[PDB]
Ligand binder design. Structure first.
Ligand SMILES: Cc1cccc(C)c1OCC(=O)N[C@@H](Cc1ccccc1)[C@@H](O)C[C@H](Cc1ccccc1)NC(=O)[C@H](C(C)C)N1CCCNC1=O
Length: 330
């Protein structure tokens, strides 16, 4: 089997991407944030505290003839930015772009934190990291990809995120028309439950490539590119007037600037992020100071190849017995 679904930026800055997902019988379509950095499929629901729902589409399990409460099961998650959600668990039928999983754990929110309430465009998350990170207690549950993997033509999914444009998540096959050149594969450590890999280095604009190992995670659920402070300082030094602002919480730059590209290494291959991908617009409405898309990972504890990096590539998440990650230019 295979599946294919279009993923769409939620706003003009590509702050996140949403993908339609069919849940239950008859289908209830919710737009979920596909997140290779977490392993819970959770949704706004008829059980979510009413004051915490503000425009989201909700899952109503009582209207699904295939929904079953998973007795005694609860979930609770806290994300890297301090956002959180929690609730109970149903099993139900879940389909993505024609690919169907029966018995998928659908985590129904009773509580969500304010950042989720304030984003009317995201109806929940679909986790695509490894199932060891799933938060359901007392019995951990499997991700959508884990449940589907054995049925897929190939045990893979691919992320093709667009810049200011729609893109595609494919399950079970590699669309050889979606990229240029070859796919370079690189080793993955699953010990932290992430798609964790080691970049071979970087370059800023037309500058010299610096060979240096950068351990980090491929995370479709993080907007920006978070890299070591030395790397990020070298990038923003090439942007006249850029500075790290402690009040804003990262590097800002004059909105009139033309940003240089940023290149990262995948083995001997190179992925080039165009400068425009690194512009996240005014820090506040009407300001001429703009927020940078490459930021220091010092406060995080891990480097994150988020959407800024991944949308410059066609990315293969290979879930074979020994998982690997593939990157191609496109
Ligand atoms: C679940 C789990 C188990 C074990 C260990 C950890 C760290 C676990 O947490 C996983 C985790 O936080 N993953 C995040 C990136 C992560 C992995 C490991 C450590 C730290 C972080 C990321 O993919 C998911 C989450 C999605 C989200 C959150 C709030 C609103 C909307 C979307 N995204 C975010 O937190 C990011 C942060 C990092 C800037 N974020 C917040 C919104 C706006 N945009 C955005 O980019």
């Amino acid at each position: 089997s295979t599946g294919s679904a279009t993923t769409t930026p939620i706003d003009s800055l590509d702050d996140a991407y949403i993908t339609p997902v069919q849940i239950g019988t008859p289908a209830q379509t919710l737009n979920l944030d596909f997140d290779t950095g977490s392993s819970d499929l959770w949704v706004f629901s008829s059980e979510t505290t009413a004051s915490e729902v503000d425009g989201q589409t909700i899952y109503t399990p009582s209207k699904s003839t295939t929904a079953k409460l998973l007795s005694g099961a609860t979930w609770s998650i806290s994300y890297g930015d301090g956002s959180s959600s929690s609730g109970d668990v149903y099993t139900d039928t879940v389909s993505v772009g024609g690919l169907t999983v029966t018995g998928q754990a659908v985590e129904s929110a009773k509580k969500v934190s304010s950042s989720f309430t304030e984003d009317s465009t995201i109806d929940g998350l679909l986790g695509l990291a490894f199932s060891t990170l799933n938060t359901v207690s007392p019995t951990q549950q499997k991700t959508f990809f884990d449940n589907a993997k054995a049925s897929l033509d190939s045990p893979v999914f691919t992320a093709d995120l667009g810049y200011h444009a729609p893109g595609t998540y494919n399950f079970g096959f590699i669309d050889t028309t979606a990229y240029t050149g070859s796919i370079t594969y690189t080793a993955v450590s699953t010990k932290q439950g992430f798609w964790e890999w080691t970049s071979t280095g970087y370059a800023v604009g037309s500058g010299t490539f610096k060979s240096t190992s950068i351990d980090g995670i491929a995370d479709t659920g993080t907007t920006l590119l978070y890299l070591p402070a030395t790397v990020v300082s070298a990038y923003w030094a090439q942007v006249s007037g850029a500075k790290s602002s402690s009040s804003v919480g990262g590097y800002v730059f004059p909105c009139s600037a033309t940003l240089p590209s940023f290149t990262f290494g995948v083995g001997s291959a190179r992925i080039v992020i165009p400068g425009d991908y690194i512009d996240f617009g005014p820090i506040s409405t009407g300001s001429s100071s703009c927020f940078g898309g490459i930021q220091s990972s010092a406060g995080i504890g891990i480097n994150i190849f988020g959407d800024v990096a991944l949308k410059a590539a066609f990315v293969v998440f290979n879930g074979a017995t020994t998982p690997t990650l593939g990157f191609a230019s496109k």
